[PDB]
Amino acid sequence: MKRRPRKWKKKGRMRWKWIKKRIRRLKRQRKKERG
Amino acid sequence: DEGYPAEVIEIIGRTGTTGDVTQVKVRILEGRDKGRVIRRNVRGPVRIGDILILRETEREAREIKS
Amino acid sequence: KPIIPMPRSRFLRVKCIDCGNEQIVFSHPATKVRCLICGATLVEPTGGKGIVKAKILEVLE
Amino acid sequence: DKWKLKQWYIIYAPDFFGGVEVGLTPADDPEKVLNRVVEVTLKDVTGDFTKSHVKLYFQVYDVKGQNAYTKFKGMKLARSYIRSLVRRKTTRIDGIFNITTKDGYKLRVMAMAIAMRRIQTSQERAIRKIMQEIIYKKAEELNFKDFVLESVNGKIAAEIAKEAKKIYPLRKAEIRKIKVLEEP
Amino acid sequence: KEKWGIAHIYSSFNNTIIHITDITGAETISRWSGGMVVKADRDEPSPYAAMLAARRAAEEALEKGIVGVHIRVRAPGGSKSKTPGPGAQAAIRALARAGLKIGRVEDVTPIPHDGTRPKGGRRGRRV
RNA sequence: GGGACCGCCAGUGGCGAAGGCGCCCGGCUGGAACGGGUCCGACGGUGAGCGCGGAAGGCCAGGGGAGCGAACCGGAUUAGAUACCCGGGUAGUCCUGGCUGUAAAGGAUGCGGGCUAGGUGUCGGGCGAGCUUCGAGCUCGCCCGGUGCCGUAGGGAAGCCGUUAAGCCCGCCGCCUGGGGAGUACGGCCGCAAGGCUGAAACUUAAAGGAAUUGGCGGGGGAGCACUACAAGGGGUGGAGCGUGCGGU
């Protein structure tokens, strides 16, 4: 979890904060159903 | 008709949105503020020394901000 | 900038006022300077040149 | 209506303020007049317009018939005046002190100093300490009323500036506000 | 003896209130808001509602033995705005013009040294 | 009565290793620069492994809960409102003890030494002149350190930088090797948890990206124009019939 500054330029992109948070929610649910 | 005539002396400059209102300085020629100089507006053409009639002397216009 | 550093501090042959005592003292003392016999102070340390009070007789380098 | 049921009681300034007359208040009962604050200006009491900024609050406490006699709640300088004094590239030095007078009148006074330019903090500490000790002294030697008047004319501020010259010149020294906390 | 009262002229950007009280400010004499004189809430802070209401309160005070008045201008103060509304000047002129002898005209907006966090959130009232 | 917070003074002040640090007094402690080499004698520089404190927010236990305000509850706006505006309102924001080790923590500039035209200010220490109501209290020159701004040579794609280097040499550490896939999968270790610290591959792509030039555009900013605009003033179209055109049949 070492975020690339390049990804923060909103050109052709969604705001990086929210993509990070989405990945985190996905992480949550996956680790949950694993155990 | 409680009016008060006053004498124009100096013209401050065209005022209002469209410049059709002209700002002048007028001296109250009669009333409770005799001789007092007030900045007052004029719709329609005006010159120096016109006698303009006031309903209220107390009203005043803000200084023209450039 | 001077190539060889030369000290801005000289030494002072001085005469004390009270007991007539000669002494060699420093221009920028880091501490107090007092006389041998009467004991009174001679030069006060400060941020720079010490505060002389007695009479300077000669300037040594 | 009620307003006809009111009657006017005259107020009287404190005796040490020359016992001047200032104004009247309408009350439906005398009991509603006690502990009534009145805000006056020293130009009114002494007539001196030069010190118009200073204001005195009098808590009205004594009613004999129609007449009202008061106590000296406190003093405040005019906020506009203080604002005018304060300027950029200048220091503001505020000294707050509780104090007992010679006659047991307990008090809070805070005092004001401003210099021409920006000064070192330690010098401000020295200013505070010197003014502190001076006001302690004047409290010791002087009683309530005389000390109050002595503060009113500001000559305390004058001697304060005189002694504070020995640390840094002052654009103006003064006593911003005074609150008689309680009586003996 | 000439009678002097206190005219508290509160002015926000939504309303103006003119309250006339005795020299101690402990007894009410005349208290007229902007709402008394207009029928649109938007019109309450306008200078006309101000001067009309002010004149009404002024004549009422005159009828009750008042002649002189000390004006006390007030902005909302606190964490709220500090500039008096546009109607305060109009109301002061009206009180002068209603036959009241005007004395001290000062501001009494309570200015805080260090006040609560104001309203609206961190990014401001995002109009 | 209560809880927070300490205005103007505040500045291109100060201090701090960094995030960060401002009400007054007294105490305790940490240091730094300046002036004196009085001392030691290379005792150094850097740092893989290690260790420390470390903004907001979150979390565990207890207290506290003025205002503000995540969630939530209403009012309004709208085609729609899960928002923007408004009325409230929980966790939070405060104190105590512990955890969590994160940010545009950005000068987007790892640190130490030697060299290198200048101009100028403030900050602070020292020195020398001038002023003095005699307080290093006020003006000027210099030296040192920090902090800008301008700037020669010089650099660099350019933006720009330029003795506070991003120029030239010496010492050490880390990091980087087209773009997505991805800070993901698996695994390890840590943390009560949310998470943290390490971390690929397949496959897919001719660009991605950086600086500046011109035009264009701005529900940006200034200046100036009046008639295909507007303010003053003024006529009349659209309602009825016809001439004639365009669409329609």
mmCIF file with all atom_site columns, C-alpha atoms in Angstrom, chain D:
data_model
loop_
_atom_site.group_PDB
_atom_site.id
_atom_site.type_symbol
_atom_site.label_atom_id
_atom_site.label_alt_id
_atom_site.label_comp_id
_atom_site.label_asym_id
_atom_site.label_entity_id
_atom_site.label_seq_id
_atom_site.pdbx_PDB_ins_code
_atom_site.Cartn_x
_atom_site.Cartn_y
_atom_site.Cartn_z
_atom_site.occupancy
_atom_site.B_iso_or_equiv
_atom_site.pdbx_formal_charge
_atom_site.auth_seq_id
_atom_site.auth_comp_id
_atom_site.auth_asym_id
_atom_site.auth_atom_id
_atom_site.pdbx_PDB_model_num
ATOM 1   C CA . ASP D 1 1   ? -51.661 50.651 30.425 1.00 0.00 ? 1   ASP D CA 1
ATOM 2   C CA . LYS D 1 2   ? -48.641 50.403 32.704 1.00 0.00 ? 2   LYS D CA 1
ATOM 3   C CA . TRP D 1 3   ? -46.394 53.246 31.589 1.00 0.00 ? 3   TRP D CA 1
ATOM 4   C CA . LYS D 1 4   ? -48.405 55.788 33.547 1.00 0.00 ? 4   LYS D CA 1
ATOM 5   C CA . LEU D 1 5   ? -47.653 53.742 36.656 1.00 0.00 ? 5   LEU D CA 1
ATOM 6   C CA . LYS D 1 6   ? -43.935 54.582 36.434 1.00 0.00 ? 6   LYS D CA 1
ATOM 7   C CA . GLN D 1 7   ? -42.254 57.489 38.208 1.00 0.00 ? 7   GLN D CA 1
ATOM 8   C CA . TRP D 1 8   ? -38.798 58.960 37.813 1.00 0.00 ? 8   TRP D CA 1
ATOM 9   C CA . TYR D 1 9   ? -36.041 58.603 40.399 1.00 0.00 ? 9   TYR D CA 1
ATOM 10  C CA . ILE D 1 10  ? -32.982 60.805 40.113 1.00 0.00 ? 10  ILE D CA 1
ATOM 11  C CA . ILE D 1 11  ? -29.563 59.184 40.246 1.00 0.00 ? 11  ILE D CA 1
ATOM 12  C CA . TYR D 1 12  ? -26.504 60.642 41.931 1.00 0.00 ? 12  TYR D CA 1
ATOM 13  C CA . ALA D 1 13  ? -22.897 59.998 41.100 1.00 0.00 ? 13  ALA D CA 1
ATOM 14  C CA . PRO D 1 14  ? -20.541 58.728 43.813 1.00 0.00 ? 14  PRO D CA 1
ATOM 15  C CA . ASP D 1 15  ? -19.447 61.357 46.300 1.00 0.00 ? 15  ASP D CA 1
ATOM 16  C CA . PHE D 1 16  ? -15.786 61.045 45.338 1.00 0.00 ? 16  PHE D CA 1
ATOM 17  C CA . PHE D 1 17  ? -16.869 61.832 41.758 1.00 0.00 ? 17  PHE D CA 1
ATOM 18  C CA . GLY D 1 18  ? -18.134 65.212 42.974 1.00 0.00 ? 18  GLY D CA 1
ATOM 19  C CA . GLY D 1 19  ? -21.650 63.902 43.577 1.00 0.00 ? 19  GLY D CA 1
ATOM 20  C CA . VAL D 1 20  ? -22.783 65.218 40.223 1.00 0.00 ? 20  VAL D CA 1
ATOM 21  C CA . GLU D 1 21  ? -26.281 64.711 38.853 1.00 0.00 ? 21  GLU D CA 1
ATOM 22  C CA . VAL D 1 22  ? -26.614 62.719 35.622 1.00 0.00 ? 22  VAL D CA 1
ATOM 23  C CA . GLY D 1 23  ? -30.099 61.423 34.922 1.00 0.00 ? 23  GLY D CA 1
ATOM 24  C CA . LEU D 1 24  ? -33.337 59.838 36.051 1.00 0.00 ? 24  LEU D CA 1
ATOM 25  C CA . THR D 1 25  ? -34.966 56.455 35.586 1.00 0.00 ? 25  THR D CA 1
ATOM 26  C CA . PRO D 1 26  ? -38.674 55.540 35.572 1.00 0.00 ? 26  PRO D CA 1
ATOM 27  C CA . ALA D 1 27  ? -39.595 52.640 37.849 1.00 0.00 ? 27  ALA D CA 1
ATOM 28  C CA . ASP D 1 28  ? -42.888 51.092 38.868 1.00 0.00 ? 28  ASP D CA 1
ATOM 29  C CA . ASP D 1 29  ? -41.433 50.387 42.309 1.00 0.00 ? 29  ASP D CA 1
ATOM 30  C CA . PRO D 1 30  ? -38.326 51.641 44.117 1.00 0.00 ? 30  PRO D CA 1
ATOM 31  C CA . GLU D 1 31  ? -37.353 48.016 44.741 1.00 0.00 ? 31  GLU D CA 1
ATOM 32  C CA . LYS D 1 32  ? -36.808 47.599 40.990 1.00 0.00 ? 32  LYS D CA 1
ATOM 33  C CA . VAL D 1 33  ? -34.179 50.370 40.975 1.00 0.00 ? 33  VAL D CA 1
ATOM 34  C CA . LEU D 1 34  ? -31.487 48.783 43.126 1.00 0.00 ? 34  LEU D CA 1
ATOM 35  C CA . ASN D 1 35  ? -28.263 47.354 41.719 1.00 0.00 ? 35  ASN D CA 1
ATOM 36  C CA . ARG D 1 36  ? -28.920 49.245 38.496 1.00 0.00 ? 36  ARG D CA 1
ATOM 37  C CA . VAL D 1 37  ? -25.899 49.831 36.313 1.00 0.00 ? 37  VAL D CA 1
ATOM 38  C CA . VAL D 1 38  ? -25.481 53.243 34.708 1.00 0.00 ? 38  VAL D CA 1
ATOM 39  C CA . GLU D 1 39  ? -22.850 53.920 32.034 1.00 0.00 ? 39  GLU D CA 1
ATOM 40  C CA . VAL D 1 40  ? -21.411 57.446 32.168 1.00 0.00 ? 40  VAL D CA 1
ATOM 41  C CA . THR D 1 41  ? -18.508 59.324 30.586 1.00 0.00 ? 41  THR D CA 1
ATOM 42  C CA . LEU D 1 42  ? -15.977 61.376 32.519 1.00 0.00 ? 42  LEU D CA 1
ATOM 43  C CA . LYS D 1 43  ? -16.641 64.304 30.187 1.00 0.00 ? 43  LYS D CA 1
ATOM 44  C CA . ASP D 1 44  ? -20.105 64.357 31.724 1.00 0.00 ? 44  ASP D CA 1
ATOM 45  C CA . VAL D 1 45  ? -18.959 64.294 35.346 1.00 0.00 ? 45  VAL D CA 1
ATOM 46  C CA . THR D 1 46  ? -15.979 66.650 35.207 1.00 0.00 ? 46  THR D CA 1
ATOM 47  C CA . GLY D 1 47  ? -16.907 68.453 31.991 1.00 0.00 ? 47  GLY D CA 1
ATOM 48  C CA . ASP D 1 48  ? -13.521 67.558 30.508 1.00 0.00 ? 48  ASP D CA 1
ATOM 49  C CA . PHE D 1 49  ? -14.024 66.556 26.884 1.00 0.00 ? 49  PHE D CA 1
ATOM 50  C CA . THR D 1 50  ? -10.382 65.545 26.439 1.00 0.00 ? 50  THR D CA 1
ATOM 51  C CA . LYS D 1 51  ? -11.023 62.343 28.445 1.00 0.00 ? 51  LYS D CA 1
ATOM 52  C CA . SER D 1 52  ? -14.394 61.521 26.891 1.00 0.00 ? 52  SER D CA 1
ATOM 53  C CA . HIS D 1 53  ? -13.183 58.004 26.061 1.00 0.00 ? 53  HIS D CA 1
ATOM 54  C CA . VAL D 1 54  ? -13.082 56.925 29.716 1.00 0.00 ? 54  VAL D CA 1
ATOM 55  C CA . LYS D 1 55  ? -16.351 55.425 30.968 1.00 0.00 ? 55  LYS D CA 1
ATOM 56  C CA . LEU D 1 56  ? -17.529 54.697 34.505 1.00 0.00 ? 56  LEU D CA 1
ATOM 57  C CA . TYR D 1 57  ? -20.154 52.123 35.417 1.00 0.00 ? 57  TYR D CA 1
ATOM 58  C CA . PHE D 1 58  ? -22.081 52.877 38.600 1.00 0.00 ? 58  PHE D CA 1
ATOM 59  C CA . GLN D 1 59  ? -24.107 50.172 40.308 1.00 0.00 ? 59  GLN D CA 1
ATOM 60  C CA . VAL D 1 60  ? -27.116 51.900 41.884 1.00 0.00 ? 60  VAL D CA 1
ATOM 61  C CA . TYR D 1 61  ? -27.734 50.527 45.372 1.00 0.00 ? 61  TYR D CA 1
ATOM 62  C CA . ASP D 1 62  ? -29.141 53.216 47.729 1.00 0.00 ? 62  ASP D CA 1
ATOM 63  C CA . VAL D 1 63  ? -32.637 54.698 47.434 1.00 0.00 ? 63  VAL D CA 1
ATOM 64  C CA . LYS D 1 64  ? -33.952 57.318 49.860 1.00 0.00 ? 64  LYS D CA 1
ATOM 65  C CA . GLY D 1 65  ? -37.430 58.292 48.719 1.00 0.00 ? 65  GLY D CA 1
ATOM 66  C CA . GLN D 1 66  ? -37.158 59.433 45.115 1.00 0.00 ? 66  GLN D CA 1
ATOM 67  C CA . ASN D 1 67  ? -33.363 59.787 45.110 1.00 0.00 ? 67  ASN D CA 1
ATOM 68  C CA . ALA D 1 68  ? -30.863 57.105 44.068 1.00 0.00 ? 68  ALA D CA 1
ATOM 69  C CA . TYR D 1 69  ? -27.278 56.882 45.342 1.00 0.00 ? 69  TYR D CA 1
ATOM 70  C CA . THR D 1 70  ? -24.777 54.583 43.672 1.00 0.00 ? 70  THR D CA 1
ATOM 71  C CA . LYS D 1 71  ? -21.494 52.742 44.077 1.00 0.00 ? 71  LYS D CA 1
ATOM 72  C CA . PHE D 1 72  ? -18.643 52.661 41.556 1.00 0.00 ? 72  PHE D CA 1
ATOM 73  C CA . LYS D 1 73  ? -18.928 49.374 39.669 1.00 0.00 ? 73  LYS D CA 1
ATOM 74  C CA . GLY D 1 74  ? -15.969 49.841 37.377 1.00 0.00 ? 74  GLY D CA 1
ATOM 75  C CA . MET D 1 75  ? -14.104 51.715 34.683 1.00 0.00 ? 75  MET D CA 1
ATOM 76  C CA . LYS D 1 76  ? -13.483 50.943 31.034 1.00 0.00 ? 76  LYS D CA 1
ATOM 77  C CA . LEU D 1 77  ? -11.783 52.841 28.261 1.00 0.00 ? 77  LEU D CA 1
ATOM 78  C CA . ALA D 1 78  ? -13.661 53.357 25.006 1.00 0.00 ? 78  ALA D CA 1
ATOM 79  C CA . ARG D 1 79  ? -13.176 50.440 22.649 1.00 0.00 ? 79  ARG D CA 1
ATOM 80  C CA . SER D 1 80  ? -12.823 52.762 19.654 1.00 0.00 ? 80  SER D CA 1
ATOM 81  C CA . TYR D 1 81  ? -10.032 54.621 21.442 1.00 0.00 ? 81  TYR D CA 1
ATOM 82  C CA . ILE D 1 82  ? -8.124  51.436 22.233 1.00 0.00 ? 82  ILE D CA 1
ATOM 83  C CA . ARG D 1 83  ? -8.558  50.236 18.656 1.00 0.00 ? 83  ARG D CA 1
ATOM 84  C CA . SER D 1 84  ? -7.187  53.552 17.417 1.00 0.00 ? 84  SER D CA 1
ATOM 85  C CA . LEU D 1 85  ? -4.093  53.254 19.578 1.00 0.00 ? 85  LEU D CA 1
ATOM 86  C CA . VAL D 1 86  ? -3.281  49.711 18.453 1.00 0.00 ? 86  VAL D CA 1
ATOM 87  C CA . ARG D 1 87  ? -1.322  49.697 15.197 1.00 0.00 ? 87  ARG D CA 1
ATOM 88  C CA . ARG D 1 88  ? 0.782   47.233 13.272 1.00 0.00 ? 88  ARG D CA 1
ATOM 89  C CA . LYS D 1 89  ? 4.546   47.080 13.817 1.00 0.00 ? 89  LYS D CA 1
ATOM 90  C CA . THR D 1 90  ? 3.831   47.908 17.448 1.00 0.00 ? 90  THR D CA 1
ATOM 91  C CA . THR D 1 91  ? 3.614   45.804 20.582 1.00 0.00 ? 91  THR D CA 1
ATOM 92  C CA . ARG D 1 92  ? 0.664   45.475 22.945 1.00 0.00 ? 92  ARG D CA 1
ATOM 93  C CA . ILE D 1 93  ? 1.626   44.819 26.568 1.00 0.00 ? 93  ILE D CA 1
ATOM 94  C CA . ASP D 1 94  ? -1.151  43.812 28.952 1.00 0.00 ? 94  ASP D CA 1
ATOM 95  C CA . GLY D 1 95  ? -0.659  43.566 32.700 1.00 0.00 ? 95  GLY D CA 1
ATOM 96  C CA . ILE D 1 96  ? -3.472  41.995 34.739 1.00 0.00 ? 96  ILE D CA 1
ATOM 97  C CA . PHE D 1 97  ? -3.443  42.140 38.536 1.00 0.00 ? 97  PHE D CA 1
ATOM 98  C CA . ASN D 1 98  ? -5.793  41.484 41.382 1.00 0.00 ? 98  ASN D CA 1
ATOM 99  C CA . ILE D 1 99  ? -5.157  43.982 44.171 1.00 0.00 ? 99  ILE D CA 1
ATOM 100 C CA . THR D 1 100 ? -6.333  45.007 47.620 1.00 0.00 ? 100 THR D CA 1
ATOM 101 C CA . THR D 1 101 ? -6.354  48.704 48.494 1.00 0.00 ? 101 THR D CA 1
ATOM 102 C CA . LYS D 1 102 ? -5.327  50.285 51.777 1.00 0.00 ? 102 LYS D CA 1
ATOM 103 C CA . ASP D 1 103 ? -8.969  50.299 52.941 1.00 0.00 ? 103 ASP D CA 1
ATOM 104 C CA . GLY D 1 104 ? -9.722  46.697 52.010 1.00 0.00 ? 104 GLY D CA 1
ATOM 105 C CA . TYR D 1 105 ? -11.394 47.297 48.646 1.00 0.00 ? 105 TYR D CA 1
ATOM 106 C CA . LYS D 1 106 ? -10.547 44.320 46.428 1.00 0.00 ? 106 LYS D CA 1
ATOM 107 C CA . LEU D 1 107 ? -10.080 44.901 42.771 1.00 0.00 ? 107 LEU D CA 1
ATOM 108 C CA . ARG D 1 108 ? -8.919  43.686 39.391 1.00 0.00 ? 108 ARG D CA 1
ATOM 109 C CA . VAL D 1 109 ? -7.022  46.113 37.179 1.00 0.00 ? 109 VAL D CA 1
ATOM 110 C CA . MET D 1 110 ? -5.489  45.479 33.807 1.00 0.00 ? 110 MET D CA 1
ATOM 111 C CA . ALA D 1 111 ? -3.235  48.009 32.167 1.00 0.00 ? 111 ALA D CA 1
ATOM 112 C CA . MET D 1 112 ? -2.037  48.786 28.688 1.00 0.00 ? 112 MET D CA 1
ATOM 113 C CA . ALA D 1 113 ? 1.284   49.730 27.090 1.00 0.00 ? 113 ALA D CA 1
ATOM 114 C CA . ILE D 1 114 ? 2.311   50.276 23.448 1.00 0.00 ? 114 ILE D CA 1
ATOM 115 C CA . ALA D 1 115 ? 5.782   51.125 22.043 1.00 0.00 ? 115 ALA D CA 1
ATOM 116 C CA . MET D 1 116 ? 6.871   52.548 18.707 1.00 0.00 ? 116 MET D CA 1
ATOM 117 C CA . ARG D 1 117 ? 8.323   49.292 17.329 1.00 0.00 ? 117 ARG D CA 1
ATOM 118 C CA . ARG D 1 118 ? 8.543   45.532 17.907 1.00 0.00 ? 118 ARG D CA 1
ATOM 119 C CA . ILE D 1 119 ? 10.393  44.737 21.132 1.00 0.00 ? 119 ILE D CA 1
ATOM 120 C CA . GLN D 1 120 ? 12.121  41.757 22.697 1.00 0.00 ? 120 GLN D CA 1
ATOM 121 C CA . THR D 1 121 ? 10.001  39.578 24.945 1.00 0.00 ? 121 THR D CA 1
ATOM 122 C CA . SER D 1 122 ? 12.274  39.841 27.993 1.00 0.00 ? 122 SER D CA 1
ATOM 123 C CA . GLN D 1 123 ? 11.995  43.609 27.852 1.00 0.00 ? 123 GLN D CA 1
ATOM 124 C CA . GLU D 1 124 ? 8.227   43.132 27.938 1.00 0.00 ? 124 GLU D CA 1
ATOM 125 C CA . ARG D 1 125 ? 8.636   40.993 31.042 1.00 0.00 ? 125 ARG D CA 1
ATOM 126 C CA . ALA D 1 126 ? 10.601  43.809 32.650 1.00 0.00 ? 126 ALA D CA 1
ATOM 127 C CA . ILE D 1 127 ? 7.888   46.290 31.666 1.00 0.00 ? 127 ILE D CA 1
ATOM 128 C CA . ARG D 1 128 ? 5.264   44.081 33.267 1.00 0.00 ? 128 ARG D CA 1
ATOM 129 C CA . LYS D 1 129 ? 7.271   43.601 36.451 1.00 0.00 ? 129 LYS D CA 1
ATOM 130 C CA . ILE D 1 130 ? 7.994   47.299 36.899 1.00 0.00 ? 130 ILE D CA 1
ATOM 131 C CA . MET D 1 131 ? 4.399   48.396 36.312 1.00 0.00 ? 131 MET D CA 1
ATOM 132 C CA . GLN D 1 132 ? 3.315   45.573 38.611 1.00 0.00 ? 132 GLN D CA 1
ATOM 133 C CA . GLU D 1 133 ? 5.417   46.749 41.521 1.00 0.00 ? 133 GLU D CA 1
ATOM 134 C CA . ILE D 1 134 ? 4.431   50.381 40.960 1.00 0.00 ? 134 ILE D CA 1
ATOM 135 C CA . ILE D 1 135 ? 0.719   49.600 41.070 1.00 0.00 ? 135 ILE D CA 1
ATOM 136 C CA . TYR D 1 136 ? 1.240   47.463 44.163 1.00 0.00 ? 136 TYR D CA 1
ATOM 137 C CA . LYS D 1 137 ? 2.865   50.481 45.776 1.00 0.00 ? 137 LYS D CA 1
ATOM 138 C CA . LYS D 1 138 ? 0.132   52.931 44.814 1.00 0.00 ? 138 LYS D CA 1
ATOM 139 C CA . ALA D 1 139 ? -2.443  50.461 46.091 1.00 0.00 ? 139 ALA D CA 1
ATOM 140 C CA . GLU D 1 140 ? -0.583  50.253 49.404 1.00 0.00 ? 140 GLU D CA 1
ATOM 141 C CA . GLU D 1 141 ? -0.249  53.973 50.069 1.00 0.00 ? 141 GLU D CA 1
ATOM 142 C CA . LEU D 1 142 ? -3.648  55.068 48.702 1.00 0.00 ? 142 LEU D CA 1
ATOM 143 C CA . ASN D 1 143 ? -7.199  54.281 49.755 1.00 0.00 ? 143 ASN D CA 1
ATOM 144 C CA . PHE D 1 144 ? -10.096 53.303 47.514 1.00 0.00 ? 144 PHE D CA 1
ATOM 145 C CA . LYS D 1 145 ? -11.486 56.672 46.444 1.00 0.00 ? 145 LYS D CA 1
ATOM 146 C CA . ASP D 1 146 ? -8.235  58.607 46.144 1.00 0.00 ? 146 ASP D CA 1
ATOM 147 C CA . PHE D 1 147 ? -6.655  55.739 44.226 1.00 0.00 ? 147 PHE D CA 1
ATOM 148 C CA . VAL D 1 148 ? -9.702  55.608 41.961 1.00 0.00 ? 148 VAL D CA 1
ATOM 149 C CA . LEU D 1 149 ? -9.455  59.322 41.173 1.00 0.00 ? 149 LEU D CA 1
ATOM 150 C CA . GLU D 1 150 ? -5.680  59.081 40.789 1.00 0.00 ? 150 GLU D CA 1
ATOM 151 C CA . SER D 1 151 ? -6.315  56.366 38.206 1.00 0.00 ? 151 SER D CA 1
ATOM 152 C CA . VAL D 1 152 ? -9.072  58.449 36.624 1.00 0.00 ? 152 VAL D CA 1
ATOM 153 C CA . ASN D 1 153 ? -6.757  61.341 35.810 1.00 0.00 ? 153 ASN D CA 1
ATOM 154 C CA . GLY D 1 154 ? -4.258  58.764 34.556 1.00 0.00 ? 154 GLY D CA 1
ATOM 155 C CA . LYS D 1 155 ? -1.240  60.224 36.351 1.00 0.00 ? 155 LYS D CA 1
ATOM 156 C CA . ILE D 1 156 ? -0.488  56.629 37.330 1.00 0.00 ? 156 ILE D CA 1
ATOM 157 C CA . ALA D 1 157 ? -0.095  56.031 33.602 1.00 0.00 ? 157 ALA D CA 1
ATOM 158 C CA . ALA D 1 158 ? 2.196   59.065 33.445 1.00 0.00 ? 158 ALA D CA 1
ATOM 159 C CA . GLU D 1 159 ? 4.582   57.858 36.146 1.00 0.00 ? 159 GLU D CA 1
ATOM 160 C CA . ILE D 1 160 ? 4.319   54.401 34.589 1.00 0.00 ? 160 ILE D CA 1
ATOM 161 C CA . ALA D 1 161 ? 5.580   55.732 31.274 1.00 0.00 ? 161 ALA D CA 1
ATOM 162 C CA . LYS D 1 162 ? 8.233   57.746 33.116 1.00 0.00 ? 162 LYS D CA 1
ATOM 163 C CA . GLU D 1 163 ? 9.713   54.651 34.737 1.00 0.00 ? 163 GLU D CA 1
ATOM 164 C CA . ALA D 1 164 ? 9.167   52.479 31.638 1.00 0.00 ? 164 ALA D CA 1
ATOM 165 C CA . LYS D 1 165 ? 11.319  54.827 29.575 1.00 0.00 ? 165 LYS D CA 1
ATOM 166 C CA . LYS D 1 166 ? 14.236  53.082 31.333 1.00 0.00 ? 166 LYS D CA 1
ATOM 167 C CA . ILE D 1 167 ? 13.476  49.897 29.343 1.00 0.00 ? 167 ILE D CA 1
ATOM 168 C CA . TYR D 1 168 ? 11.932  51.228 26.138 1.00 0.00 ? 168 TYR D CA 1
ATOM 169 C CA . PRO D 1 169 ? 9.938   54.310 25.092 1.00 0.00 ? 169 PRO D CA 1
ATOM 170 C CA . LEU D 1 170 ? 6.170   53.830 25.143 1.00 0.00 ? 170 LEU D CA 1
ATOM 171 C CA . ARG D 1 171 ? 3.766   55.211 22.575 1.00 0.00 ? 171 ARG D CA 1
ATOM 172 C CA . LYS D 1 172 ? 1.132   55.128 25.304 1.00 0.00 ? 172 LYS D CA 1
ATOM 173 C CA . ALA D 1 173 ? 0.723   53.636 28.769 1.00 0.00 ? 173 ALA D CA 1
ATOM 174 C CA . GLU D 1 174 ? -2.688  53.557 30.435 1.00 0.00 ? 174 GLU D CA 1
ATOM 175 C CA . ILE D 1 175 ? -5.155  51.523 32.492 1.00 0.00 ? 175 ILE D CA 1
ATOM 176 C CA . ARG D 1 176 ? -7.574  49.788 30.133 1.00 0.00 ? 176 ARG D CA 1
ATOM 177 C CA . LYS D 1 177 ? -10.105 48.428 32.607 1.00 0.00 ? 177 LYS D CA 1
ATOM 178 C CA . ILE D 1 178 ? -10.876 48.292 36.316 1.00 0.00 ? 178 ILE D CA 1
ATOM 179 C CA . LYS D 1 179 ? -13.388 46.086 38.150 1.00 0.00 ? 179 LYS D CA 1
ATOM 180 C CA . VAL D 1 180 ? -14.142 46.565 41.831 1.00 0.00 ? 180 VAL D CA 1
ATOM 181 C CA . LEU D 1 181 ? -14.396 42.888 42.633 1.00 0.00 ? 181 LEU D CA 1
ATOM 182 C CA . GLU D 1 182 ? -15.850 43.320 46.113 1.00 0.00 ? 182 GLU D CA 1
ATOM 183 C CA . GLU D 1 183 ? -15.808 45.620 49.148 1.00 0.00 ? 183 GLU D CA 1
ATOM 184 C CA . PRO D 1 184 ? -14.348 45.037 52.620 1.00 0.00 ? 184 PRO D CA 1
#
